[PDB]
Design a protein around this nucleic acid. Sequence first.
RNA 1: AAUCUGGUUGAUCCUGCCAGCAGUCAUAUGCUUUGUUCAAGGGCUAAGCCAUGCACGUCUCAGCGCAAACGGAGUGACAGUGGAUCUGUGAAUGGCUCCUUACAUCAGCAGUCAUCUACGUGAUAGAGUGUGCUCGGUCCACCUGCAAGGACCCCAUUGGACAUCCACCAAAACCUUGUGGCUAAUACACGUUCGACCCAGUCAGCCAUGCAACACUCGGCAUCACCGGUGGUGGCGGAUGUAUGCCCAGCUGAUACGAAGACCAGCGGCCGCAAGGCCAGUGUUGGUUGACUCAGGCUGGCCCUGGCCGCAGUGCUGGUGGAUUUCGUGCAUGCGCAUGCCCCACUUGAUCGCAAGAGCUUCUGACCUAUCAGCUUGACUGUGGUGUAUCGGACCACAGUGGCCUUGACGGGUAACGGAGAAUCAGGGUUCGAUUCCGGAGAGGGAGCCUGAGAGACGGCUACCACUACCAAGGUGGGCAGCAGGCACGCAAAUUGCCCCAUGCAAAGACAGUCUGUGAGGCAGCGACGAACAGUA
RNA 2: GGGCUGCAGGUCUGCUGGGUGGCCGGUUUGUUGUUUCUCUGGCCAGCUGUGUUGGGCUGCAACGGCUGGUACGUCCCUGCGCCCACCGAUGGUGAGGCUCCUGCCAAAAGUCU
RNA 3: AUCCACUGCAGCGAAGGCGUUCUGCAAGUGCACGUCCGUCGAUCAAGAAUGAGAGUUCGGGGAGCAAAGAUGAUCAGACACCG
RNA 4: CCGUCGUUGCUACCGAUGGUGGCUGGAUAGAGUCAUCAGGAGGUUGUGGAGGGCAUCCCAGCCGAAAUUGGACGAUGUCCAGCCACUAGAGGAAGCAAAAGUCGUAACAAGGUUGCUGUAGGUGAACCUGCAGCAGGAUCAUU
RNA 5: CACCAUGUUCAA
RNA 6: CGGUCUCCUCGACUAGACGUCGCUUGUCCACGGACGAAAUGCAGCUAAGGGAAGUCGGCAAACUGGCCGUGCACCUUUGGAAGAUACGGUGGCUCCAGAGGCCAUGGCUCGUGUGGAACUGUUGCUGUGCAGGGGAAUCUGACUGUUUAAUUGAAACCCA
Lengths: 199, 148, 265
Amino acid sequence: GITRWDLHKKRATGGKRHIHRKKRKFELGRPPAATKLVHGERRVRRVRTRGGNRKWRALRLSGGIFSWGSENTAKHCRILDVVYNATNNELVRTKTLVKGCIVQIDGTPFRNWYYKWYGIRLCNPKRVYKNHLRKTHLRRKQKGFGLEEGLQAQLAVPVCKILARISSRPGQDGRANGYILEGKELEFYQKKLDKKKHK
Amino acid sequence: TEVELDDNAFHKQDNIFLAAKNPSSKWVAPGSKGRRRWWKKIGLGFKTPKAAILGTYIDHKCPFTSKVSIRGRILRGIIIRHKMFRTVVVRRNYLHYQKKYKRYEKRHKNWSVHISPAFDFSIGDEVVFGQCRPLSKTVTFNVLQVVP
Amino acid sequence: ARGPKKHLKRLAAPKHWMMDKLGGIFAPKPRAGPHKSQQCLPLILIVRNRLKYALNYREAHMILKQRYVKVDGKVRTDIKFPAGFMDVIEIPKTGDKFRVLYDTKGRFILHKIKGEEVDFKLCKVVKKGTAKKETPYVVTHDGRTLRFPDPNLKKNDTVVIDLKTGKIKEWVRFKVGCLLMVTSGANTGRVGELVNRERHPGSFDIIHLKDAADNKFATRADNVFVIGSSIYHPLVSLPKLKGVKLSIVEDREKKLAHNSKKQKQ
RNA sequence: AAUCUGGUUGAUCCUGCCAGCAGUCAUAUGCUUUGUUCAAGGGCUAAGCCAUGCACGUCUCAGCGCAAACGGAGUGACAGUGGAUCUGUGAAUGGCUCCUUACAUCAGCAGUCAUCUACGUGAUAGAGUGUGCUCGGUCCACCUGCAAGGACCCCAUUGGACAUCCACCAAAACCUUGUGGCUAAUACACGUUCGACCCAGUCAGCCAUGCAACACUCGGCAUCACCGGUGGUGGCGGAUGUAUGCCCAGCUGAUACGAAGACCAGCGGCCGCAAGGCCAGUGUUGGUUGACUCAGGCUGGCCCUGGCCGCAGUGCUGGUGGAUUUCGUGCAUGCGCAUGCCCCACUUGAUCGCAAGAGCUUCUGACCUAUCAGCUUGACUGUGGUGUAUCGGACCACAGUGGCCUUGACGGGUAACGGAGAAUCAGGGUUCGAUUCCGGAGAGGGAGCCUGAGAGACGGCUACCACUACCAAGGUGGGCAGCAGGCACGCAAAUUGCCCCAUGCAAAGACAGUCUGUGAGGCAGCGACGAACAGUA
RNA sequence: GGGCUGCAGGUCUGCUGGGUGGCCGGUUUGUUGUUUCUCUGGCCAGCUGUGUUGGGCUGCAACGGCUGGUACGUCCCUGCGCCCACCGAUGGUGAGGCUCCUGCCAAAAGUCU
RNA sequence: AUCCACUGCAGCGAAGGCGUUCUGCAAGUGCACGUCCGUCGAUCAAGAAUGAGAGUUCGGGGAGCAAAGAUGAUCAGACACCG
RNA sequence: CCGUCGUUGCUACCGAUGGUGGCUGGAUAGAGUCAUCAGGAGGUUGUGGAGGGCAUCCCAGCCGAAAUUGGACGAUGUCCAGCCACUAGAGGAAGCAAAAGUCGUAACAAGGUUGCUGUAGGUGAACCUGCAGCAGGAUCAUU
RNA sequence: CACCAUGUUCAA
RNA sequence: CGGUCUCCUCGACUAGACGUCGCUUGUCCACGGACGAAAUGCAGCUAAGGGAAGUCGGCAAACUGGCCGUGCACCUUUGGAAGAUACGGUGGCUCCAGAGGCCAUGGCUCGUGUGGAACUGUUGCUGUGCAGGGGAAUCUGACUGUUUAAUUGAAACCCA
């Protein structure tokens, strides 16, 4: 079947290699998952692997755990759409989820979370506890606090569409986890989106 | 030169989180401008280039600023040519002793070796390169020292 | 079709077992137990070939499955259990009590011992790790774990474990001056105190040993075995030649004298 | 044994070959062949084709026994033996052959800090658990829920099948097959309180004391506005007490070179009744490696009543055998009151090592050929992914134009499987190595798979091709380069033997009561291959 | 590089054309006679001693039997022994460290001169 | 067309080869030397430049000699020597 | 002693026209399987209600075969190309071998025209001739 | 310096 | 229905002064009508199965056909042969790349000129007109050119 060996791949010189064995199972490959972004249901097929272990082909994922690195938050956030891919636009067009692809995610969590945690409302909406007031103002007065101008401009629209990058390998663990872009990577990919919106 | 990369992706270093609120001074280097950089000191009697420690380039397959571990043979060759990107051809002219005729032959072996952007080198300079995991079809060695 | 091989030909058998090349096509392939296959004696070899209770393979199976051959303070019924170096083998119905050691020629002898000598064992630390829940452990050459060692017990040291409880009773450092035994290479079975350790980072360090009399030899640091804080306090009983290898002319003269004085009667 | 001799001339001295002489654990053959001991033996050619038979099964006290199959014996659940069957596990080892294969295989060296693992072995193991609670399940409360509120229940251990069996049977057959009815589990499904305790953390409340009129607000008005609230410090505490694997993100995983002051906040301690000043005290977080993003550890991954997740997994079996005295106080102490104890093994499974293997990878080293000089276009590198057990153009998308070569690339040839080794060998070397040990490859040629820890398996399946066997013509099949044996092909190679006694291997398995299997292996037969010792006086 | 204090031979110096044997150095072989010394097992004085049997081992010792019976000092050459020329280091920490010195002044004599 | 005699144990040229006289053009070796450089060299698969005579190609020339051919002898023959 | 010519045999070469086998590459169709998209034969649990527990229905759930769509791996057929190996062939032309066939005498002596080399032409055959060279010549030698 | 061709096979 | 000198010459498809259709201009004039319109004929087409067996002879017709990509043998005068032979594709739609210019890296103009991909269709796309069948030899003239107006176009004549 799909073999990931190099007995067919010619020598580094350019000389042909004469194969004198047939394909061993320990060097097989399996067809790509090509995880599609699908609004709704998740599909995950378990795959029996070299030691009887499991891999998890994600077919048709919908969302996943997305982390706010500076904030240590990690909410499950319902991927909206694949916006950018590093090299080929065919995966962006057909909405294929692969690691290191850039996606718009819901982000109404990390907003309700930001409120619950800091007591800070990021958009004008469109009992009260003494200990909660105390703790929210403490977490406000901590040192590294402050929401950056590229993240709050996103969390301040009434329909949040925050830019995350997918970190898991969905065809291997069946997950579309990722991290929200922060700072210079956010600026990079926002600039790419600008370029292809204008050109 | 080869610090340049593609502009299709945002090349970051693996073990450095660029958006840390209160980062530590563990990777603040003693000659940098506050720029944090993960690096290691491969430890077979080699020195981590100041270019690697204080540089800005991003390189996986670099033995000093990436997860690539130097283990196995460590050979010495000459840079034949540098016509690939971050890869370089290295030659080892050695002498193989024929037993019957009690003499030697001139033989050679080429190697597609991986030069990190931490090394200044001209064509013809000597190189010590150590073995790493396979980085490509023919590349399985990284350049650990350039000798003028 | 290939998987793990189950057989060991008689020719491909470890030479330190004096397997006769005509007495069968196969040799009992050791199981993957505590000791390495080329540094171990199968219990069938200890029971049939050395201590000839078992006249053959069948009687070896019988003796062993009758659950009265005890190796390291517990019964081992596998006829291919790889009993190795510094293991204690007791047969209570016979009152036999051996520690399996190396003779100066590099073969596994069964050195007869007594009570306290059988009630503990001596095992060298080879690895030192941490398991989940922050559990520092030290893997030894008998493959055992010792899930909570003293913090000041670095790698190449040796340990005195009590075969009843299986915990650590003592340990001996690998610093220069310790009494030491060789367990591989040409110099295996020789005892000599540590003189100096040449470092070779990235490769094998070398250990220079001074024999009991005055000879000097060298070996590898993963090839040495600590037995005793010094040549005055060996942490275990030791065989007839006490680890002092003779020259080959000396050995030939010794054999000749023995044969002659035996024929004298 | 550092060896020569015959041949060119009428004779001579050379070159030079021929021939002789010798050898081979090289094969073949001709004649001849007494004993004893060893021993190669359809490799060369046809990896051509195969009639028949056998070569892989396995059971203990210890997974399932209501077969009267054999059986002791009595109110008994099963005495015991026990074909069968389901389940587990093995059939991936061994045996054969050398067609292929020219840095390929292989040998030695090295790496996995890029990985997988059944049997084996040493340790380990505390899951009512998506929010502090409501929320393990029922029974009441209050008001778009609460901050302290309760009564019970769970623990003598689940469910439904299909086997063996009975019965009716389809078919010419088939190691082909249907149906109906029972009946098991260590099968399958399903289930998990007391296997924790405490601590962190999360939520909430409260206390003592302190500057202060600054900020943001709850309360009244359509941004010009008037009075409360929160802030600092030090504590206590009511609710719970988030077990573990995979996945993602953040943090840690240190340092081993070196000198002093001021000030403003807070926090200590000292002199202090205090005021105020002050600095003498001062213990109440880091493994491994040569090297790590590694090991290990910490944190986040439920939200505002439905919604979303459902993050897949892990429960030392809802298991088995033997033994047998299970009281919570039996022992005792101090005087029943309080405390330490109150079966042993086997076994399904999870984790971490180790061991035993494997995959991949490193460096150097192979024959003849130039009547093969240019070869290569996934070709060479890079970035981002995919896939894999894992690294990798292994595959893909986008970039670039590389990579090898007279130090012989690319191609061609095989009197090419490789090595350990064999024969000679003063030395240097020459030739061979199908063949027993190791490695590789294959199972008629290809290719694709399932199961499983492990196979691209062939005494497994699926298909095509080439041949082929049975037929009741609709259908069913085949795989000896396993062991014997046959036909071919040839110069050229054995018995359709007996047995597990030895050597080992496998399994649910010491031996016996009560036959584990084994064409591996052994022993015989044939055997002037080839060796050693004797006789024929 | 000068050299040479200092071992054998060579520079030097004078010789040796005698025929057997046992004894002695050493134990050389089959023998005895110890037992230095662990080890073995009890008894005996509250597992340590104490003598002991068994084999181990030889501090060895004899018995037949034995075999083995070129010299000082002097000119230097090597093996060494020296005097006499000129101009890899440093910094921390421990190691479940070692060694040496270590309270005050200092006669005379002692040393560098 | 060719440069007799001189013309040789003479010279020169890497070899093939080079011979009347005057003359143009560039060159080489050797010798002499307290000139310069400072190893820049030797031999060379591949590659390159010369290479008698014969032969071919294009355009001329043609005395002498001369393959083929013609032709007279010689001869057994003689499209051979000889003319 | 050499070469034609004659006889018999063997070996290879050229040769119109072919034949067979193998390998590699491309194209085309494409078995089977793996993955995917579907599907839901059938089997089996529950929802309260109204008939007092029965295919009562409703609504659901779980497992799940055939079939469907389609990516890959890819057997195999056919065509095409290249290459290699073996092989038939009328005829042509060589080489060699085999006692006593024919024609000459080219060479070996100054071999009766010294011999030979390169090339060119002629010729029954050896060979002859031209040009230039060589001595391995029949001259180490004459102002 | 007219012309002067040849001598079957083995054996010696 | 023959012949006869020159000039101008639009739009769409297309390489186009081919070919097909259309605006401007011009014209419906050629002896007509009925009858589905015999046989025969001259023209246009088809035809199962076979595929030159027809015939002096594959005559006649058919096959092929544009463009793009890959690629191409013998022989050779080294120029060719060659479009050798051969293989694949071609629509529609939605996109992704991709070249330039002007005003001042934004406004505007801006590849009917190319490559890739997804979807799509009863596999079909140079969809019509148009538009090579190919290969292997023998004889012959080297070639190109010329030729008997009205039966011979040739191997004839001419050429270098």
